C-alpha cells in the first residue's frame, strides 16, 4: 500500500533530529523549535509549564498535520533570557514534579490492601 | 466468528468470558444483562461485545 509504517510515529528517520531550533523573524527573543517523533503528549506539557515562567512572554504549540508526528513550539522571552534556557527551566520542572508524584504514588499504594 | 479477544474500543480482554457467559445463562438462569454484569463487563462498549457476538464457528465445525 501507501500506509507509512507505524514505527514512524516514535522513531527518527535517517538524518532527522529530535529538535531543530530556528530564530523567529517576526519578533525578538523568539524561537521556533520543531520536535520530531512527538505529539501532543509532550507538546501540550512543555507548553503549559513555559507559561508558569513569568519571563515567558509567549508560548504555543501545534501539530500542523495529523499524519506526521511532529510539533512546532514557539517561545518568546524577555530581553536577556534565552528561550532555550526557558525550555531547560521548563523541562526541569516537569521531571521534578513527576519525580514527586511517582513517589507520592509508590507510597499511597503500600498503605493499601487488595 | 469467535468471541473477539478484546473490546474493540477500550481493550479489555473479553475473550476469556464467552463460556462463562453462556454457562451463566443456561446453568444459573440469569437474564443477559445480569450475567454480563457479573463478569464485570460494565461499560456499554464491552457489554456490546458479548451481547451481540454471534458464534458462527459452532456452525463451521459441522462440516467435515
Amino acid at each position: 500500500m501507501n500506509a507509512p509504517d507505524r514505527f514512524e510515529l516514535f522513531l527518527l528517520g535517517e538524518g532527522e533530529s529530535k529538535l531543530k531550533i530556528d530564530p523567529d523573524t517576526k519578533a525578538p527573543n523568539a524561537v521556533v523549535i520543531t520536535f520530531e517523533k512527538e505529539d501532543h503528549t509532550l507538546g501540550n506539557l512543555i507548553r503549559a509549564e513555559l507559561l508558569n515562567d513569568r519571563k515567558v512572554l509567549f508560548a504555543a504549540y501545534k501539530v500542523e498535520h495529523p499524519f506526521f508526528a511532529r510539533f512546532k513550539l514557539r517561545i518568546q522571552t524577555t530581553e536577556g533570557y534565552d528561550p532555550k534556557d526557558a525550555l531547560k527551566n521548563a523541562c526541569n520542572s516537569i521531571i521534578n514534579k513527576l519525580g514527586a508524584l511517582k513517589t507520592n504514588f509508590e507510597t499511597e499504594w503500600n498503605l493499601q490492601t487488595l | 466468528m469467535i468471541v473477539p479477544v478484546r473490546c474493540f474500543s477500550c481493550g479489555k480482554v473479553v475473550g476469556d468470558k464467552w463460556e462463562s457467559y453462556l454457562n451463566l445463562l443456561q446453568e444459573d438462569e440469569l437474564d443477559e444483562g445480569t450475567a454480563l454484569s457479573r463478569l464485570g463487563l460494565k461499560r456499554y462498549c464491552c457489554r456490546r461485545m458479548i451481547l451481540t457476538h454471534v458464534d458462527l464457528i459452532e456452525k463451521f465445525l459441522r462440516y467435515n
Partner: protein
Amino acid sequence: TTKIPQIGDKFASRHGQKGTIGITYRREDMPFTAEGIVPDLIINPHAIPSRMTVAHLIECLLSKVAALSGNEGDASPFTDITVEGISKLLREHGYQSRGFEVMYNGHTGKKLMAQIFFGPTYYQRLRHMVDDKIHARARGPGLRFGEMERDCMIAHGAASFLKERLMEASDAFRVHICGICGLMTVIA
C-alpha cells in the same frame, strides 16, 4: 486477503447515508467520556438535519439502553415505542436521557464546551474500497478527457494545453505546398 479498514473505505448506517473514512486516530487522541469510553467512529452533525434521518438518532438511543440493560432493542416500524419511553429507561440507568454525555478533548484533557450525542449504532462496511478504485496510467512501452473536459479547457482559454493533450505522438511530418493551389504537389 485480509482487508483492514483504511482512509478511503466506505461505511454506512442503515438510514441511507454513507461516508468514507477521512482519517484514523489512535484512542489517546479521541475525545472521551468520564468513564473513559471512546468512540469507534465519529460522524459530523451537518449530515443530519437535512437528511431528516431521525431513525438514526432513535436507533442510537435505543441501542445505548439495550447495551446497558442486556435486552435486544425493538426498532420495528409501527409499534408504540417512543423516544420518551426510551429516554426514561436510559435515565434509570444513569445517563442523561437524550443520549448526550460530557466528553473531554483528547489532546488536552479539557472538557468540551458542548456535550456529545454518543452511543452505539449499527454500521455496515461496504464493498468497493480505495485499493480496487486507484489506478494511474502515464505510459512506459472514468479517467479521461472527453468532450466536456475539453470545453472546460476552452472556457479557460488554454489552447496550448488543449493541443498537447489531444495531439498525436504520430510525428510531425513535414511537406512543401504550392501557395496558389494549396496541394502537396511540390517537388522539392
